[PDB]
Amino acid sequence: PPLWRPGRVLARLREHQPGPVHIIDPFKVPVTEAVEKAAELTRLGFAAVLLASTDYESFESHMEPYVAAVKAATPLPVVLHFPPRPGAGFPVVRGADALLLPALLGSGDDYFVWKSFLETLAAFPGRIPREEWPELLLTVALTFGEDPRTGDLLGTVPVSTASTEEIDRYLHVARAFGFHMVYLYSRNEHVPPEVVRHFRKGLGPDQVLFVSGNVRSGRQVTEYLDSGADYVGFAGALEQPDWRSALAEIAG
Amino acid sequence: APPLWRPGRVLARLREHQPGPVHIIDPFKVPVTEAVEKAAELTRLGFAAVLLASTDYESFESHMEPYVAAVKAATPLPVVLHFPPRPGAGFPVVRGADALLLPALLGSGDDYFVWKSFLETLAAFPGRIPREEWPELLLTVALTFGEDPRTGDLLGTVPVSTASTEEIDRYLHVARAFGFHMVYLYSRNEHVPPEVVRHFRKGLGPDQVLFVSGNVRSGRQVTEYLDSGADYVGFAGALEQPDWRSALAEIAG
Numbered sequence A: 001p002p003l004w005r006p007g008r009v010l011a012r013l014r015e016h017q018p019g020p021v022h023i024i025d026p027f028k029v030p031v032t033e034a035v036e037k038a039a040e041l042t043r044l045g046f047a048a049v050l051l052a053s054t055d056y057e058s059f060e061s062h063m064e065p066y067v068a069a070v071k072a073a074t075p076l077p078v079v080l081h082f083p084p085r086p087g088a089g090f091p092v093v094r095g096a097d098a099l100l101l102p103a104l105l106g107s108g109d110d111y112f113v114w115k116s117f118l119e120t121l122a123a124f125p126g127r128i129p130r131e132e133w134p135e136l137l138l139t140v141a142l143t144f145g146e147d148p149r150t151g152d153l154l155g156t157v158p159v160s161t162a163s164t165e166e167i168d169r170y171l172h173v174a175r176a177f178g179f180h181m182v183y184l185y186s187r188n189e190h191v192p193p194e195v196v197r198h199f200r201k202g203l204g205p206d207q208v209l210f211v212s213g214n215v216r217s218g219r220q221v222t223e224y225l226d227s228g229a230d231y232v233g234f235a236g237a238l239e240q241p242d243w244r245s246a247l248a249e250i251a252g
Numbered sequence B: 001a002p003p004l005w006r007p008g009r010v011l012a013r014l015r016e017h018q019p020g021p022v023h024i025i026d027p028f029k030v031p032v033t034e035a036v037e038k039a040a041e042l043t044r045l046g047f048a049a050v051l052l053a054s055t056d057y058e059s060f061e062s063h064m065e066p067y068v069a070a071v072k073a074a075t076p077l078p079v080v081l082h083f084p085p086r087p088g089a090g091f092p093v094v095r096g097a098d099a100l101l102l103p104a105l106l107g108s109g110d111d112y113f114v115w116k117s118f119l120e121t122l123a124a125f126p127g128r129i130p131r132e133e134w135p136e137l138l139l140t141v142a143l144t145f146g147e148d149p150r151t152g153d154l155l156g157t158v159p160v161s162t163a164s165t166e167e168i169d170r171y172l173h174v175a176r177a178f179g180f181h182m183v184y185l186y187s188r189n190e191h192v193p194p195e196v197v198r199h200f201r202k203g204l205g206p207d208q209v210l211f212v213s214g215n216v217r218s219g220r221q222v223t224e225y226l227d228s229g230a231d232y233v234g235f236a237g238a239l240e241q242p243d244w245r246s247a248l249a250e251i252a253g
């Protein structure tokens, strides 16, 4: 089993053409609605389905059957993205194709910078046979704009864009440590397109670049893809009754 | 549960013990009876720990479990293992060791030796050894100085540039933000520059332990490195000879 080495999911993300990726928050979206949504993602040509949230409780009992219901509705890989908790590490369930593991390089708490990875692997394989574990996508995760919620929870400080000094240090780490992916996120604002370009030009060719946060239009998706993002994530735009119209606009 | 990667007793002792020399016994070259004779002397000098370390090893578990047990019966000092990892296995480990020094070779061109060795080692934990009997892990930034094709060929290391502080400062930023426990500055064929030691001491947090080793053969060298800010000054080869008692007395005095 690849585990922390590159596997099937990373290969699919590297070779698929760039595009939008819908993110289903499984603790806010009822499983029946997630299944209806998942059936549409497949038709649009998205590369994967991400299940992600800042908050979670009773993870294993909720997520194992939630992941199975989504997998029955779409052939796309199902990737989990959640923060770790001291004493447990990152949450995991069998059936997920991959876990996106964020190393929060801008956090003031070394647990969220990377020690969460050590706690997670110490606990591996735990309850799940090694042969059935999801693959791990080792990711540099950076936050942009004022965000006291993630700051309070994970210790993140917004990345300073007054110079490229801080991002240049993250680029050196992303390259030398052989991270698989970089995830640029803004909870309350927008990751700057020029930061996306700086990362695309500074990363190796096989390092996958995700951008998300407040993407609500196809124009925003296009601008980020033109700036070099491999995938543009969006969750909140579809957390409403008229999600089918919003999805068609974002994917158009 | 074992502290494992969290700070434990061995790190607390390294943090609080008086700075000084630390002898490193290569267990694949030094016979165990000589290691035991050495261990008794290191105890008298009040060194902080006994390191068992080597670039090379074979049949690790069967050789090291009895070797560590004999050294532990000879000294009350913590026994710390320091060896390179191997893809497919991670770092080598035996029960009985108090701690394993885990080197993140930040200057390597191979990401396995930069840090993925840590992921393979923890994945494999607990493995063949019960959780409660595992050694503590000392998370360490490991940096090499001077021409060294042996470590370059084995682990992908490139000598750290001392032409400016650009490279070193990036390693300090990582050492601090990632919360490494220790920094180990090593030169196989030359000497780590005392000024680099001082730059690291000034740049590290107060609880980050700084080790320097490589070609230390005299007490004057130990004093110079301790005066430059090293917490511990390692030495192996100086004692790999018949007149080791004289050499130890000169390095420790």
Ligand SMILES: CC(C)=CCC/C(C)=C/CC/C(C)=C\CO[C@H](COP(=O)(O)O)C(=O)O
Residues within 6 Å of the ligand: A023, A052, A053, A054, A081, A082, A083, A084, A102, A104, A141, A142, A143, A150, A183, A184, A185, A187, A212, A213, A214, A215, A233, A234, A235, A236, A237
């Ligand atoms: C901070 C970090 C990057 C990782 C640590 C783990 C962590 C907190 C993972 C949860 C997923 C996440 C980064 C943000 C939540 O929502 C956005 C979509 O936003 P929108 O509703 O605005 O589209 C998403 O899932 O990407």
Ligand SMILES: CC(C)=CCC/C(C)=C/CC/C(C)=C\CO[C@H](COP(=O)(O)O)C(=O)O
Residues within 6 Å of the ligand: B024, B053, B054, B055, B082, B083, B084, B085, B103, B105, B142, B143, B144, B151, B184, B185, B186, B188, B213, B214, B215, B216, B234, B235, B236, B237, B238
């Ligand atoms: C490259 C690195 C720092 C870590 C990777 C793992 C690794 C190769 C561990 C083995 C220990 C080591 C760094 C060097 C061997 O001898 C010196 C003492 O030298 P002297 O005989 O000149 O006194 C020592 O043990 O420190």
Ligand SMILES: [Mg+2]
Residues within 6 Å of the ligand: A121, A122, A123, A124, A125, B122, B123, B124, B125, B126
């Ligand atoms: Mg494990």
